[PDB]
């Protein structure tokens, strides 16, 4: 498995044409503020293809 390719799985809003977003902030899911921590209702935006 080659895990050197990633794709942004979670996003707050849709991406604009010809726009680049390289941030790795914690996706705010649900209603509990993540405040930077991961776990329940807080997923990582990037995911490996495998």
């Amino acid at each position, epitope marked *: 498995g080659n895990y050197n390719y990633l794709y942004r799985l979670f996003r707050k809003s849709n991406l604009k044409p010809f726009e680049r977003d390289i941030s790795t902030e914690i996706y705010q899911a649900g209603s509990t503020p993540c405040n930077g921590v*991961e776990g329940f209702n807080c997923y*990582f935006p990037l995911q490996s293809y495998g």
Partner: antibody
Amino acid sequence: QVQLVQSGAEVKRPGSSVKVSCKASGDTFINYAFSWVRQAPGQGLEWMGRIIPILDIAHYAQKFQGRLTITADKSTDTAYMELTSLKSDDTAVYFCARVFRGSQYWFDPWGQGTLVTVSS
Amino acid sequence: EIVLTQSPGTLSLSPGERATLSCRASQSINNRHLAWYQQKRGQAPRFLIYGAASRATGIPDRFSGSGSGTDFTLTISRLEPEDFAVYYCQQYGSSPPTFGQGTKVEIKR
């Protein structure tokens, strides 16, 4: 469930390049970050650094910015640690933790630890 | 956020009473980001409480904590002989994670 198996103690000399391994079995290796924490005898814990396997980026501390070299093999699911110019006060128990992939995290799993004696 | 100091340090408590381990905050922990552990004699630490209020799956109900902005506690009721170890504090509200010195609970003989 996260069996973080490590290696044994290594008797080194003052000034070397140690290489401690940490077998990360159980769940996947890329969905969780890893951090190494030293434990000096009777001096609590100290966070040295952290590695992100999915991003291949490290975040060292102020006292290890340039000396510590923490890597992680994404094939054998093993995290490594390397430190250059080992001084006398480096005889601590190096633990292996599996932190989350966030800016703020806790050390939920741990390891058996390695009593790497440098001063010999 | 950088300094954690255990107030008791040592506590010779009877096997079955209640204990209180303090960890005073230094730089006004923002979102109650503190963690508790249990480092037994010659073993690895065990995660007990995250966020200073919520417990972990598998931890007995006797372990509990309280604290809002500058002082967190650890309320353990009816300490069994197995719960006699060193407990540390870890804050994750700032960028550099820091620890404390640890409080050793010994048997009251």
